[PDB]
Scaffold this motif. Sequence first.
Motif, PDB file in Angstrom:
ATOM      1  N   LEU A  64       0.909  -1.127  -0.085  1.00  0.00           N
ATOM      2  CA  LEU A  64      -0.067  -0.054   0.075  1.00  0.00           C
ATOM      3  C   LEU A  64       0.951   1.285   0.011  1.00  0.00           C
ATOM      4  O   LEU A  64       0.608   2.099  -0.552  1.00  0.00           O
ATOM      5  CB  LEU A  64      -0.806  -0.007   1.359  1.00  0.00           C
ATOM      6  CG  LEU A  64      -2.065   0.919   1.136  1.00  0.00           C
ATOM      7  CD1 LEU A  64      -3.139   0.441  -0.122  1.00  0.00           C
ATOM      8  CD2 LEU A  64      -2.979   1.012   2.459  1.00  0.00           C
ATOM      9  N   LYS A  65       2.120   1.288   0.463  1.00  0.00           N
ATOM     10  CA  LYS A  65       2.892   2.493   0.771  1.00  0.00           C
ATOM     11  C   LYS A  65       3.629   2.675  -0.644  1.00  0.00           C
ATOM     12  O   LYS A  65       3.672   3.651  -1.082  1.00  0.00           O
ATOM     13  CB  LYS A  65       3.946   2.303   1.931  1.00  0.00           C
ATOM     14  CG  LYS A  65       3.279   2.223   3.301  1.00  0.00           C
ATOM     15  CD  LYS A  65       4.327   1.990   4.134  1.00  0.00           C
ATOM     16  CE  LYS A  65       3.365   2.156   5.746  1.00  0.00           C
ATOM     17  NZ  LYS A  65       4.481   1.754   6.765  1.00  0.00           N
ATOM     18  N   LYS A  66       4.063   1.623  -1.089  1.00  0.00           N
ATOM     19  CA  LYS A  66       4.849   1.461  -2.510  1.00  0.00           C
ATOM     20  C   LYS A  66       3.945   2.034  -3.638  1.00  0.00           C
ATOM     21  O   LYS A  66       4.529   2.703  -4.399  1.00  0.00           O
ATOM     22  CB  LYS A  66       5.393   0.181  -2.705  1.00  0.00           C
ATOM     23  CG  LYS A  66       6.695   0.025  -1.925  1.00  0.00           C
ATOM     24  CD  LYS A  66       7.267  -1.485  -2.286  1.00  0.00           C
ATOM     25  CE  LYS A  66       8.476  -1.658  -1.330  1.00  0.00           C
ATOM     26  NZ  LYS A  66       8.997  -3.059  -1.288  1.00  0.00           N
ATOM     27  N   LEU A  67       2.413   1.665  -3.708  1.00  0.00           N
ATOM     28  CA  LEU A  67       1.487   2.313  -4.540  1.00  0.00           C
ATOM     29  C   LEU A  67       1.352   3.712  -4.487  1.00  0.00           C
ATOM     30  O   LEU A  67       1.244   4.395  -5.550  1.00  0.00           O
ATOM     31  CB  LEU A  67       0.203   1.597  -4.311  1.00  0.00           C
ATOM     32  CG  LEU A  67      -0.044  -0.007  -4.596  1.00  0.00           C
ATOM     33  CD1 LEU A  67      -1.086  -0.371  -3.780  1.00  0.00           C
ATOM     34  CD2 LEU A  67       0.570  -0.565  -5.817  1.00  0.00           C
ATOM     35  N   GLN A  68       1.523   4.366  -3.149  1.00  0.00           N
ATOM     36  CA  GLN A  68       1.462   5.588  -2.969  1.00  0.00           C
ATOM     37  C   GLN A  68       2.652   6.431  -3.507  1.00  0.00           C
ATOM     38  O   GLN A  68       2.679   7.613  -3.829  1.00  0.00           O
ATOM     39  CB  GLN A  68       1.278   5.962  -1.489  1.00  0.00           C
ATOM     40  CG  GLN A  68      -0.343   5.531  -1.299  1.00  0.00           C
ATOM     41  CD  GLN A  68      -1.239   6.568  -1.980  1.00  0.00           C
ATOM     42  OE1 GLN A  68      -1.023   7.464  -1.743  1.00  0.00           O
ATOM     43  NE2 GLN A  68      -2.210   5.780  -2.260  1.00  0.00           N
ATOM     44  N   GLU A  69       3.856   5.764  -3.455  1.00  0.00           N
ATOM     45  CA  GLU A  69       5.089   6.470  -3.886  1.00  0.00           C
ATOM     46  C   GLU A  69       5.305   6.598  -5.147  1.00  0.00           C
ATOM     47  O   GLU A  69       6.195   7.387  -5.657  1.00  0.00           O
ATOM     48  CB  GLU A  69       6.339   5.735  -3.091  1.00  0.00           C
ATOM     49  CG  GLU A  69       6.112   5.623  -1.679  1.00  0.00           C
ATOM     50  CD  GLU A  69       7.397   4.950  -1.109  1.00  0.00           C
ATOM     51  OE1 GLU A  69       8.035   4.189  -1.794  1.00  0.00           O
ATOM     52  OE2 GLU A  69       7.742   5.126   0.230  1.00  0.00           O
ATOM     53  N   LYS A  70       4.686   5.882  -5.979  1.00  0.00           N
ATOM     54  CA  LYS A  70       4.952   5.890  -7.390  1.00  0.00           C
ATOM     55  C   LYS A  70       3.821   6.479  -8.071  1.00  0.00           C
ATOM     56  O   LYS A  70       2.591   6.099  -8.104  1.00  0.00           O
ATOM     57  CB  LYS A  70       5.090   4.449  -8.006  1.00  0.00           C
ATOM     58  CG  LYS A  70       6.415   3.842  -8.392  1.00  0.00           C
ATOM     59  CD  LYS A  70       6.332   2.880  -9.346  1.00  0.00           C
ATOM     60  CE  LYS A  70       7.625   2.497 -10.098  1.00  0.00           C
ATOM     61  NZ  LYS A  70       7.375   1.639 -11.317  1.00  0.00           N
ATOM     62  N   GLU A  71       4.059   7.484  -9.087  1.00  0.00           N
ATOM     63  CA  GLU A  71       3.118   8.370  -9.965  1.00  0.00           C
ATOM     64  C   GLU A  71       2.420   7.394 -10.553  1.00  0.00           C
ATOM     65  O   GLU A  71       1.201   7.666 -10.940  1.00  0.00           O
ATOM     66  CB  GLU A  71       4.035   9.324 -10.805  1.00  0.00           C
ATOM     67  CG  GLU A  71       3.152   9.989 -11.754  1.00  0.00           C
ATOM     68  CD  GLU A  71       2.404  11.285 -10.889  1.00  0.00           C
ATOM     69  OE1 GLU A  71       1.757  10.810  -9.825  1.00  0.00           O
ATOM     70  OE2 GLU A  71       2.505  12.354 -11.556  1.00  0.00           O
ATOM     71  N   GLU A  72       2.749   6.228 -11.330  1.00  0.00           N
ATOM     72  CA  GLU A  72       2.258   5.344 -12.009  1.00  0.00           C
ATOM     73  C   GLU A  72       1.060   4.586 -11.431  1.00  0.00           C
ATOM     74  O   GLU A  72      -0.029   4.040 -11.880  1.00  0.00           O
ATOM     75  CB  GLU A  72       3.045   4.283 -12.962  1.00  0.00           C
ATOM     76  CG  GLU A  72       4.562   4.972 -13.096  1.00  0.00           C
ATOM     77  CD  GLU A  72       5.379   4.174 -12.572  1.00  0.00           C
ATOM     78  OE1 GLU A  72       5.512   2.790 -12.340  1.00  0.00           O
ATOM     79  OE2 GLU A  72       6.317   5.057 -11.747  1.00  0.00           O
ATOM     80  N   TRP A  73       1.180   4.402 -10.089  1.00  0.00           N
ATOM     81  CA  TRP A  73       0.469   3.343  -9.372  1.00  0.00           C
ATOM     82  C   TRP A  73      -0.544   4.143  -8.303  1.00  0.00           C
ATOM     83  O   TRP A  73      -1.535   3.650  -7.847  1.00  0.00           O
ATOM     84  CB  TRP A  73       1.483   2.490  -8.457  1.00  0.00           C
ATOM     85  CG  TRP A  73       2.329   1.576  -9.139  1.00  0.00           C
ATOM     86  CD1 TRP A  73       2.101   1.152 -10.528  1.00  0.00           C
ATOM     87  CD2 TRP A  73       3.191   0.994  -8.856  1.00  0.00           C
ATOM     88  NE1 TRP A  73       2.869   0.275 -10.759  1.00  0.00           N
ATOM     89  CE2 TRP A  73       3.686   0.085  -9.783  1.00  0.00           C
ATOM     90  CE3 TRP A  73       3.884   0.791  -7.529  1.00  0.00           C
ATOM     91  CZ2 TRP A  73       5.002  -0.765  -9.591  1.00  0.00           C
ATOM     92  CZ3 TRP A  73       5.091  -0.040  -7.125  1.00  0.00           C
ATOM     93  CH2 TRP A  73       5.511  -0.779  -8.351  1.00  0.00           C
ATOM     94  N   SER A  95      -5.685   6.053   5.726  1.00  0.00           N
ATOM     95  CA  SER A  95      -4.955   7.179   5.965  1.00  0.00           C
ATOM     96  C   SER A  95      -3.457   6.989   5.398  1.00  0.00           C
ATOM     97  O   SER A  95      -2.484   7.887   5.270  1.00  0.00           O
ATOM     98  CB  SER A  95      -4.785   7.244   7.394  1.00  0.00           C
ATOM     99  OG  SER A  95      -3.641   8.130   7.622  1.00  0.00           O
ATOM    100  N   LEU A  96      -3.077   5.574   5.065  1.00  0.00           N
ATOM    101  CA  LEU A  96      -2.152   5.386   3.555  1.00  0.00           C
ATOM    102  C   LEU A  96      -3.042   5.638   2.606  1.00  0.00           C
ATOM    103  O   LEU A  96      -3.229   4.673   1.558  1.00  0.00           O
ATOM    104  CB  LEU A  96      -1.610   4.036   3.685  1.00  0.00           C
ATOM    105  CG  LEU A  96      -0.594   3.578   4.464  1.00  0.00           C
ATOM    106  CD1 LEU A  96      -0.704   2.163   5.137  1.00  0.00           C
ATOM    107  CD2 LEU A  96       0.970   3.656   3.875  1.00  0.00           C
ATOM    108  N   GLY A  97      -3.572   6.846   2.265  1.00  0.00           N
ATOM    109  CA  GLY A  97      -4.873   7.123   1.161  1.00  0.00           C
ATOM    110  C   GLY A  97      -5.189   5.954   0.310  1.00  0.00           C
ATOM    111  O   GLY A  97      -4.641   5.836  -0.918  1.00  0.00           O
ATOM    112  N   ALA A  98      -5.866   4.803   0.909  1.00  0.00           N
ATOM    113  CA  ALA A  98      -6.897   4.295  -0.143  1.00  0.00           C
ATOM    114  C   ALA A  98      -7.637   5.514  -0.258  1.00  0.00           C
ATOM    115  O   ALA A  98      -7.514   6.846  -0.010  1.00  0.00           O
ATOM    116  CB  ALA A  98      -7.306   2.993   0.325  1.00  0.00           C
TER     117      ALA A  98
END
Length: 120
Positions: A64-73, A95-98
């Motif tokens: 979930l964190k890695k998805l937030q860090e990448k512009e593509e994801w 609040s890890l914005g899903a």
Amino acid sequence: SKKVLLVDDSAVLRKIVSFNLKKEGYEVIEAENGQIALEKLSEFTPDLIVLDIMMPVMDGFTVLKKLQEKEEWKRIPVIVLTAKGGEEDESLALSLGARKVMRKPFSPSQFIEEVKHLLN
């Protein structure tokens, strides 16, 4: 035809969710754990991700964190499947914005309406 990445280590719940997704006309790509999920993500971009975060959460949060860090994801909608006692983790996931949570006892109709809502 929208594609959904299903990340679930529970083979029993996984089979249930997969079936209900396919019944609605979605393509389902499965990943048994976070490591496998991130590997598949290097090769394609799904329309939606469903992440089971039942304790022990293992690497659910790492994904979930890695998805937030990448512009593509960071724009891929995500539904997390939550459990009782994971109230800590749920507040996080939201609040890890899903995007959105979906409990158990499981309801296929509740799950699918949230899927339809996010894919619209």
